[PDB]
């Protein structure tokens, strides 16, 4: 499989809003995860052509990566903070789906997911 | 063409010994790194002609790879664990020497090096 186009990051056909929760997700959560030692394999869509991984987009039909989440936040793609949280969960579960329990890349995603969970525990109150 | 012969893996004129530390380096450390998802670029000597890296062996004069380290452990090439740990260090620093900060291949090597360091943290006590 060649690579698919990356997920859409702008939507001219939705209303936009900025909230405490969405700003926190960008300025705290994404930033903290981006800088983590384990983040780099998750920062851009898997380049299956470069890695020579023909089965990746045969198996992962809902790809997601931190770069896409960053762009969606910056473009006000999300109306509800849960839409963004869902994208993070898609990125972590994609790693568990493609790989196997106990794999090193899985342990990396698990550490990232634990940190993400710790940070969104502190998301500002829905206002 | 362009590749040197691989590093020597047997040494008939050197005494041999088996130790818990050498056992651990082969059966725990090497095995763990070998199975890492990022291991593949480091499992065999760099084929500079196949990768078209004609300068590789003009820059890297002390090549090292995990396949060599595996053979050296299997052949009792090392008397001291530090000789093996030095070979791992050489393999990682060779990656940093030839490539540049931020390259994917370097980020792979850094992750393997940090896991290697965690593993040899738990090397069994010397005799």
Swiss-Prot record, chains A, B:
Cross-link (Glycyl lysine isopeptide (Lys-Gly) (interchain with G-Cter in SUMO2)): 58
Highest taxon listed in the record's lineage: Eukaryota
Signal peptide positions on this chain: none
Tissue specificity as recorded in UniProt: Ubiquitously expressed.
Coiled-coil spans in chain: none
Domain (Bromo) ranges: 17-123
Annotated site residue numbers, Acetylated histone binding: 99
Location(s), subcellular: Nucleus; Chromosome
Post-translational modification comment from the UniProt entry: Phosphorylation by CK2 disrupt the intramolecular binding between the bromo domain 2 and the NPS region and promotes binding between the NPS and the BID regions, leading to activate the protein and promote binding to acetylated histones. In absence of phosphorylation, BRD4 does not localize to p53/TP53 target gene promoters, phosphorylation promoting recruitment to p53/TP53 target promoters.
Linked pathology: Cornelia de Lange syndrome 6: A form of Cornelia de Lange syndrome, a clinically heterogeneous developmental disorder associated with malformations affecting multiple systems. It is characterized by facial dysmorphisms, abnormal hands and feet, growth delay, cognitive retardation, hirsutism, gastroesophageal dysfunction and cardiac, ophthalmologic and genitourinary anomalies. CDLS6 inheritance is autosomal dominant.
Note: JQ1, a thieno-triazolo-1,4-diazepine derivative, and I-BET, a benzodiazepine derivative, have been tested on tumors with success. Treatment with GSK1210151A (I-BET151, a I-BET derivative) has strong effets on mixed lineage leukemia and promotes myeloid differentiation and leukemia stem-cell depletion.
Function: Chromatin reader protein that recognizes and binds acetylated histones and plays a key role in transmission of epigenetic memory across cell divisions and transcription regulation. Remains associated with acetylated chromatin throughout the entire cell cycle and provides epigenetic memory for postmitotic G1 gene transcription by preserving acetylated chromatin status and maintaining high-order chromatin structure. During interphase, plays a key role in regulating the transcription of signal-inducible genes by associating with the P-TEFb complex and recruiting it to promoters.
Subunit structure: Interacts with p53/TP53; the interaction is direct. Interacts (via CTD region) with CDK9 and CCNT1, acting as an associated component of P-TEFb complex. Interacts with RELA (when acetylated at 'Lys-310'). Interacts (via NET domain) with NSD3, CHD4, BICRA and ATAD5. The interaction with BICRA bridges BRD4 to the GBAF complex. Interacts (via NET domain) with JMJD6 (via JmjC and N-terminal domains); the interaction is stronger in presence of ssRNA and recruits JMJD6 on distal enhancers. Interacts with NSD3. Interacts with NIPBL.
Family stated for the protein in its record: Belongs to the BET family.
Record remark on domains: The NET domain mediates interaction with a number of chromatin proteins involved in transcription regulation (NSD3, JMJD6, CHD4, GLTSCR1 and ATAD5).
The protein's name: Bromodomain-containing protein 4
Taxonomic path: Eukaryota, Metazoa, Chordata, Craniata, Vertebrata
Gene transcribed to yield this protein: BRD4
Residue span relative to the full protein: 44 to 168 of 1362
């Amino acid at each position: 499989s060649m690579n698919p186009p990356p997920p859409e990051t702008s939507n001219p056909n939705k209303p936009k809003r900025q909230t405490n929760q969405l700003q926190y997700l960008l300025r705290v959560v994404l930033k903290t995860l981006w800088k983590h030692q384990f983040a780099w394999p998750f920062q851009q869509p898997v380049d299956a052509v470069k890695l020579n991984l023909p089965d990746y987009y045969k198996i992962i039909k809902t790809p997601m990566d931190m770069g896409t989440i960053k762009k969606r936040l910056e473009n006000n793609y999300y109306w509800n903070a849960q839409e963004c949280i869902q994208d993070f969960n898609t990125m972590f579960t994609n790693c568990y789906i493609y790989n196997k329990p106990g794999d090193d890349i899985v342990l990396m995603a698990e550490a990232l997911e634990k940190l993400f969970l710790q940070k969104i525990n502190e998301l500002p109150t829905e206002e």
